[PDB]
Every structure is written in C-alpha cells, then in structure tokens.
Amino acid sequence: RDSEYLLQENEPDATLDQQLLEDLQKKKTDLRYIEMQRFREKLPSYGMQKELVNMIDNHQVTVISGETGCGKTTQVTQFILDNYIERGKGSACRIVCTQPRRISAISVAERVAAERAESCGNGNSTGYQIRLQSRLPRKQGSILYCTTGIILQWLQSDPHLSSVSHIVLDEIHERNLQSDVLMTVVKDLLSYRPDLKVVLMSATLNAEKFSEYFGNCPMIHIPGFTFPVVEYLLEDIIEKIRYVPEYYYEAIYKERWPGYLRELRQRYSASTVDVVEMMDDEKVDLNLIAALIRYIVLEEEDGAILVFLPGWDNISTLHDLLMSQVMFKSDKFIIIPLHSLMPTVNQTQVFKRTPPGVRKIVIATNIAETSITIDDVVYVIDGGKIKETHFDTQNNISTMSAEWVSKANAKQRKGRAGRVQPGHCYHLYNSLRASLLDDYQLPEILRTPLEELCLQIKILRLGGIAHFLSRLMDPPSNEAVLLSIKHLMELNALDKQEELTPLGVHLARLPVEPHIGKMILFGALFCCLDPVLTIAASLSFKDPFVIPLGKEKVADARRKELAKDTKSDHLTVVNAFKGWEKAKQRGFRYEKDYCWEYFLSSNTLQMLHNMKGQFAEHLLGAGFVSSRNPQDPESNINSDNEKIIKAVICAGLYPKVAKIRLNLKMVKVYTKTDGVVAIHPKSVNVEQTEFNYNWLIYHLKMRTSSIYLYDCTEVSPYCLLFFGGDISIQKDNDQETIAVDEWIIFQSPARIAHLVKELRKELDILLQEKIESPHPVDWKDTKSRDCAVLSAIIDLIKT
Length: 799
Ligand SMILES: Nc1ncnc2c1ncn2[C@@H]1O[C@H](COP(=O)(O)OP(=O)(O)O)[C@@H](O)[C@H]1O
Ligand code: BEF
Ligand SMILES: [Mg+2]
What we know:
Layout: H1 14-27, H2 31-40, H3 44-47, H4 49-58, E1 61-66, H5 72-86, E2 94-99, H6 102-115, E3 126-130, E4 133-135, E5 142-147, H7 148-157, E6 166-170, H8 177-192, E7 197-202, H9 207-213, E8 219-222, E9 229-232, H10 234-241, H11 249-264, H12 270-278, H13 286-299, E10 304-308, H14 312-323, H15 326-329, E11 333-338, H16 344-348, E12 359-364, E13 377-382, E14 385-391, E15 398-404, H17 407-414, E16 423-427, H18 431-434, H19 451-459, H20 465-471, H21 478-490, H22 502-509, H23 514-525, H24 529-539, H25 552-563, H26 569-586, H27 588-597, H28 602-622, H29 642-653, E17 657-663, E18 666-670, E19 676-679, E20 695-698, E21 701-702, E22 708-709, E23 712-714, H30 717-723, E24 727-731, E25 736-740, E26 744-746, H31 751-772, H32 785-798
Parallel strand pairs: 1-7, 1-8, 2-5, 2-6, 3-5, 6-7, 9-16, 10-12, 10-13, 11-12, 13-16, 19-22
Antiparallel strand pairs: 3-4, 14-15, 17-18, 17-20, 18-19, 20-23, 21-22, 24-25, 25-26
The protein binds adenosine-5'-diphosphate (ADP), beryllium trifluoride ion (BEF) and magnesium ion.
C-alpha cells in the first residue's frame, strides 16, 4: 500500500553507478541545472558540504543544527546522494527523510526535484510518499521525503527498514507523539542495523540532549544565515503603526509589570505605553493584526504576509475582518487560510506564485511554522499563541486552549521569512512576556491522553510497555499510562491480559483517538458511514451550533426543531449538516439564510465536511471502505436507520454512559464515574421528561462545578450490552436480570447474554480475518459469513 518503496530491495550495481555518474556530468551542462546550482552555492550548507558528508560517513548517528533556512532539509539529502554518485557508488543510496506534515513532505520534495532539474517522482532521483498519495522516485540512488507517520506504518511491514541506507529524522524540535515513538524505535534499531546511517536535524534544538540520548553521538552546527530578519515586539508594533484599540510565572509577570511600564515610558511614547497597559493577554488581538496588515500593505514594500493564529475560529474571524474592508475586497489581494483539516490540494495553493500586482496574505495555524518555504513571504505576523492540548492526571479531563508561544515556535515562525530574501517578523507579545516564555513546548507525550501512545507501542510488538517507556527521551508518568490501559480495556481494544484484540489492531491503524476510531470503524462495517462521519467530525473539532447573546430562546427552539424525535444531540448535528448540504444545492444566498435561520456556522460546517473526507481516507487505507467518498452508496445502505446509527455512536462512546431516573416531572442523571450529573442547557434533552430508554451516551463533560453533559443521546440497553464491558447474569430467585459492568442493569432474558457473548466472538473472528488482508464488507452478498455476523448484531440492536 503505502509501503511500496520500503519493500523494495537495496540492490546496488556498478552499471547504474556509471549511469548516475554520467547523468550528473550531463546535468552540469544543462542551463536549468546550472542556474539552480548557482542558488545552492549561496546557501550556508554548501560550505559545509564536505564536512557534513565526511561526518555522516564516519558516524552512525549525527545531530545537525543550523539557522532556519540555512539548507538542512533540502541539501543534506542531496549531499549524501551526490557524494555517492561522484564516488561511483550512487546506486547504494536509499535516503529517506521525514517531515512532520504532509505539506512539508510534498513541497520539499518538489523543491529538491526542481533543484536537480527533474520532475518530482516519475522514477527520477527525488520523490515523496504520504498517506494514499506518492510520487515515487527510482529504485536505487534516490531520495524520498515522507511523513513520520509513514515510517511508523512501515515498521509494521519491516521493523528493520532493511532497504533504507540513510534515514534523516528532520524537524525533531516538533516533539509530537509519533516523532518520539519513531525516535525511540530508531535508537533501538541502531545495533540491529550497523549499516544504517541516522541524521538528526533541527534549527531550534537542545542538541546536547539529543546527542546524549544517542550515545553521545557527534554534533555539527551549520554556521551562517541566509537572509536577515528584523524582529518586532508588541511595543515596537504599537510604536510603529500608532495603534489605538477602538501558573506561578504569571505572579512574576504581575510583580514586574509596574516597573516594566515605568522603564517603558523612557523608551517609547506615552500613547503606546498606555496601549501596552490595556492589551489583553487572554486572546490574540485580531484588530491589532488587521491594523498591522493595513500598515504593511499601505506603507511597506512588496511581499507576502504570513499570519500565525491559534485555531480555525481566529483564522475565519480575521478573514471576515479583512474582507469586510473595501481595500481587501479588491483583487489586489489573495487571502489564503491554512488549516491542517484542509484537503492537501487546498494546502498547496499557498506555494503558487501571485501576479506582480497582487499581495498574498496567508492566515495559518502552526501547520505552516516549520520546514515549508513560501516564496514571496517577507512579513511574518506572530500572534504569539498556539493551540495546545493539556491533560490532568487527577481527573480524566483534557482541554485544548490557546497558550503562550515558546521561544522555539517563535524562532520557527520568524524562520518562515529570511529564506529567499530579507524579511520582518512581528511578535504580538511585549518584552516582559518574552523574558518569561519557555525555551520549548512540553513534548506532547507529557500533556495528552496516552491511548494512542499505548496502541502504537502494542502494534509494533516492541515488548512490554514498561520497558519502552523507560527508553523514551521524555517518559510519561506510569499513572497516566495505566489510565490509558484502563480506557483501552473498556474500549475492548485490549483484552484482560493487556494484549491487542482484533479490534485494537484496526484502531491502532487509524491515526485518531480510539474513541473516534471505533466509531468510524463500525460506521463502515454497518454501512452508515456518512451520518457517523458527520457525528465523529463534530465530536472532534466542534459542533456547528452557535448561540448569540440574548438569542438563547430562539436558538434552543431551532435545535429542538432539527432534532425531531431522535432525542439525540448527535443526530441533531446530522440533520443540521444534511439540511446545510441541501441548502448549498439550492444556492449560495439560500445557504446563508439556512445557517442564519438555525444559528449554524458555515465555516464550522465546511470544516466538518473536510474532516469527513479525511476520516474516509483513513478507512480507505485501513481497507474498511472502497472509496474516499463519505457518501459512497457501498457504505451507506443503512445510513437512514436511526437505530443502527445510534448503536455505532454507542460503539464509540462507551463507556461514557449515563443512567436516567424519573420520579412521578423530575429527571435525574447519573454516570457512575462522577455520580449525579446535569444536562448542559445547549443540549436538546434538557427539558426532556419522556424517554424511550433510561440510558444516555455522551462524549463531552464540563465542570463547571456540577458535571454537565454537553452532548447526549438516548440509547437502547441492547447497544450497551453488545459494545459494553463484562456481562453477568444476576439471579434474584424471584427473577433474573442482565448486567453490563455491574451497574448497567436492566430486565432482559438471560439467554441474550449468551447470544452477545457468541456474537462478540464472531465479530472478533471477522476483524481477525480482516487483519491480514482488509476488504470492505460486501453488503450486497445476502448469503455471506461477514454479513450474517453483522446482520445478527444489527437484528440484536433493533430488537
Ligand atoms: N520552494 C522554494 N522556492 C525557492 N527557494 C526555496 C524553496 N524551498 C527552499 N528554498 C531555499 O532553499 C533554502 C534551504 O531551505 P531548507 O533546506 O528547508 O532550510 P532548513 O532545512 O535549514 O530550514 C531556503 O533558505 C530557501 O531560500
Ligand atoms: F530550519 Be528550517 F527552517 F527547516
Ligand atoms: Mg528544515
């Protein structure tokens, strides 16, 4: 699949070595190649070419540091390949370089291929590989850029990466979950691959930490800058444009704040100091960014503008803020949003050159803060904040919030300029803020739920989790890992012996959290993909409903209207999403009337539509669907059955179950984990007193003191029975009852418990046979074993 380049055999031969050597000499007479080499010789890395190659040749692991844009990503790979070609051994090269994101892997590969007077892929020297998309280069003497997630998937097919001669772990400052796992796997692989060469590269790095981690491996610094970059703090921004607005470290900030303002009045005008005093540290001043953008386009020379915002809500707000002005309405400006949830085609448009009289303005998240080179970028506006997930060990609650940027992220955002020409960087934090920023972000493995971490360790068969944790550079706490083990058992991704179930194997192959992975997996298995992908897309990210001030009464009445009789916050999103798609088919003006009428965000809805395509791609690579279309008729035979959908929701939401108590009109809700809870007023089941079932499933909790259920749907006890935990038959002599996880009790014939035990087992056999060669369930086949098992589960859910 995505392992076509890996499963080749590194077979060097002298005949190809001679062809590559002759091809290099013919390139040296090609005008397009010669002009590219003229630019390459100007890079700081070109002076270090002999030193870098000689050091990588004499040591197995090498740490390379250098200023942003000095040439690490695009030149080091070429230095290794061209050195082998000139030595008559070019075919022995199989260089793989990792990039943290798909936009980095694609654009860098296109750039390197262009620097070598070649097209990307097509059996040339350079190509790329990402999820379900690749331009593969030739077999021998080639360079392949790819995402770190591709290498992790490669380890499932070849844990030794046998055909790879050089692996380059690039942008290692992005200490994400997958990068830390891959780095620890490579370290263990060194002794088993004495012929392998490993290179570690970043611009903002505690290099000594990485060298010591890799057995005191040698370090090499690439000195020099490509182009200067002017840096501006908040005081410098307000002074230049004359802008007037129309936990313990904060105690240090408040303590030094009055003296800082006094020292600031001696270096800046009193008006700007007053503006600095009333600036808000809670959120990014989008009015200030827009005023700075206006100053750049009206007073400064030509050059694209790149803006860094924490999330999607900030990007769309600033975009509407600029588009509401006459100046940015015209075609002299092209405003391009950039979000990770966008299709890859939309992300690449940022690299397209603009007409000479047209100014490009890119509004991006941290997706654009590393690696990528945008040609015309001269001005970088750093909002100073970045979305970060945070996890508390005491209570199972994870929060996404806009946090102050670290010094490393700021240097990477500043690094997006000064690559092809001089630049300017404006940081929206004051000097006192700068002195209190951390050097680096906390590694994601130290501040997020670790269910994906544990699934990743188990799928690679790296031995016990305890041993692998001790080998990580920054190991998480054992209490956080045990909580993940408990959650994975309740999801039935791990059995009682902490071993992967068949379901857990497929969840480990899905690059999302297992709760979402389990929901989208059974949506494909039960042929209700489109409504389930919509629900999953809204559980991640956010729901499309908005509530203006004073409009709470009318907005609630709209939501209860869209819910019909489903008693389901998640089926309400489906109906709101479907009604939105039907309004788009009507027209653009009537689509806006629909969103305003029901208080729906067209921006959020469009983002949910993009997430649905990304979820379908994950299931496509996993082999559970046959196309990238979330509305493919193959996977939507049961998409208009409310009961099957609600079961798939329950499949993903368990064990987040709530029990309803009615008193003859009072309704009380209990969740076992936190006891009594209430229903959040935004939900559709707030004033509900008539329930067909006494059980709810939820996804989001809020406290807010007394626990509130953000989104909940009523669910049948037979959905909790099948997708639940342990099943026990309780005998009261007077009568028998069935229990799920002891507390979920309901009157039911005891033989149903035996049926569920047998149907769960057949589901495991179905998923087991899907492991070796995944194939979507052919629901057209009435007399098939896979459909018979799934039909029996469906009949149990319906009755
Ligand atoms: N798409 C491109 N168009 C023009 N120049 C580019 C492009 N990509 C890279 N470059 C030039 O090549 C240099 C090397 O970039 P890169 O190797 O990514 O630097 P680093 O790895 O040190 O961040 C950049 O400074 C830039 O000037
Ligand atoms: F160091 Be480069 F900007 F990736
Ligand atoms: Mg780089």
